[PDB]
Amino acid sequence: MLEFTKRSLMNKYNINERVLELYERALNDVEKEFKYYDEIREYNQLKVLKAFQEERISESHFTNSSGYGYNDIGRDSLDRVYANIFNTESAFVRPHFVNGTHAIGAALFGNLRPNDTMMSICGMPYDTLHDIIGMDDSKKVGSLREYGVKYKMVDLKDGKVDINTVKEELKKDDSIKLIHIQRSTGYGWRKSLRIAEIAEIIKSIREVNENVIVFVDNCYGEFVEEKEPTDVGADIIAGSLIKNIGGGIATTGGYIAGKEEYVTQATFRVTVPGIGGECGSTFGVMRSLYEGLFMAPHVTIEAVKGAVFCARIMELAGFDVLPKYNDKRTDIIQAIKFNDEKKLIDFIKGIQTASPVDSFVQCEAWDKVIMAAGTFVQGASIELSADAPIREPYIGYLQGGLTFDHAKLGVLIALSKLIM
Template identity: 45%
Template sequence: MTLDNNLKLAENAVLSVEESLSKVFQERSNQVFQKLENILTIFKEEKVSTSHFNQSSGSGHDDISREKIDAVFARLFLAEKAAVRMQFVSGTHAISSVLFGILRPGDVMLSLTGQPYDTLEEVIGIRGVGKGSLKDFDIEYKQVNICENFDSFEEKIVHFFKENSCKLVFIQKSCGYSWRKSLTNHQIEKICSLIHSLDPNCICFVDNCYGELVEDSEPISKGANIIAGSLIKNLGGTIVPTGGYVAGDAELVEMACSRLTSPGIGSSAGINFGLGRLILQGLFLAPQIVHESLKGADMVAAVFKNLGFKVLPEPATYRSDLIQSVRLNNPYLVQKVCQSFQNSSPVDSFLNVVPSSMDGYDSKLLMAGGTFIEGSTSEFSADAPLRDPYNIFVQGGSNIAHIKIALIRLLSELLQEKLISKDSLLPLST
């Protein structure tokens, strides 16, 4: 079969998937209106102006750009306070600042969503003890996994609180590198309500990475006390070059900022290096980018499901974050898919994707991320830890056309290597 024929077959397959998703695509496009209207209202009422693009220097005391951006994000999240800082190098750093800022020796932290994302393992002390983890400071870590069967979440939480005291519960909204559904904000509301009924002083902390602007609400309005995330994910609109945020109860945000800077300085310092315009413009663009990513996730799910692979979530179902998981069950296929997506990237498309160690991760990773912002998962990317059952996690995408192009090229290559069949586009038995 010629390459041209492969491309035609692949294009027809992807266009057929797109047509089958037309209704949900329209619904996702309609959701942009409400979210953008809300952001425009916030910008107007907060009187955002070009003066908030100005750059300060030094410690940044009384920096009007930083203060305005914090106010805008607090309004967006319906929070008492927000801190948006370029000094947060990642979402993990923002989360770590919250944990170290709030928890004290002897406190108990409970993860309700099982073992957290890999990069938090050394923060907590699950591995890498002796480097300044929570465990090194005598903060006790416990976990239960209410996601195994959410219908029984109340029983697990009530049982834990009968036997234990707890300063902070950690809720990872996104699936991370696990094979589970990401939590919805409605589910988070149920969790926070139960926790606060059992102990009104227990702090509900939500890792909001990948979830911002996906649903019609955010976790603070559903009972979370504090949330954290990254600006090179949803809220950066693919143009913010770094940074993260924390938002929630004013006292808790200040405690997190005191860890980021120092006690006595807290949130009252920190310049944004002249990036005020990009931060605000990124937020303005974010609703559109997020919903392009959601449409892309539906398309990825449908294409791989048609190829016979397990996918989570299913195409055209309710989504609470940007991540699309695909179970490939084969390390060669993982590398093949990542390499193909890398080849369709706008940046570094010529690089070979090879398994690599990465700081904060236990397993070697394959990462396809030819993005304008290094590590930006609001742009189209895919990554996979090289461990059984060889799941791949696809996220982001500033334009559905880019994702279509990448999928068409991938299917063509799989046909060329006879990894899928010509007639049915289903995996061949081996």
């Protein structure tokens, strides 16, 4: 570390000698893990490079479509590039999705009908999916439930997917048509599901039912591993372009990838029956989406490095963390158990102060939920960010970092508010 970097961190940010010694130890400790992620990153960069070349991407795919957007070659080729990367029959990538929940919800709705049953098998889903499902019948929101779609949820057993109950439900209920698997844990204290764990779960599903649609919410997992859920038997997946796969450059949108049958059904929900993905001009965003995809394998691993570094420094400082720095990652999220409300809030506020945009904004608990979100793209979580519900045992979630230098610095700034 240059003398001038250290002087500046101490004077400008009040980073103290205690935190700097933790920093030196943590950075040395994560070196072998980091070399492991570099190998994945290189494979993934090549994977993406190959897809671009096989689709013959050129300046002409950087379209500026208008109106109906009939024959937007840029738009249609990107879908082909995503299908190739995910090893799927089809893909549907659009700026029109307002967030990742929109993509997930469209995949769900598109592939469900009255009297079908949807079954989540990783316990309670992410809060934003509750209205899509219809978990509150005092509200009229056009949920699955309101359209006659039944819902089953399998709690985790011994902290793992209760695969024996999943199989028994499949044997006993012919109306189950789609199983929902969530790759990234939300607000809990449980490790996100690795690709090999998804692979086994699907292997067990197929022993019982070869037809049920297996859907995986892939948000935050893209390019973290050398494979995606589609490589291990997922029929359809969805995610958000302002997380990993947009490389920090995409300004909005989402994707759905998988079997043509299922992707196509989702598209009729995203637009309307009879139109699907055949119309939809793209506002001039195609170059950003392409460049973002190309930079995604790299930026994803900057973020993963940030998470692994955070896990180790916080563990050394005395905090319980999940996952541990040497637990191989499947997503970019890092959880830290503060066990103290003030420590939680001080930490999150620290991340905001480490942010390039709105660094001066004082984070307020809006159970209330506090967030650091000083990013170029509003809501992008590939950029350094953090959030947490305010409740015992005061776990915070950190994710993102356009560069590891930024993530690292953020953590140093934040930890410096908690220990000296």
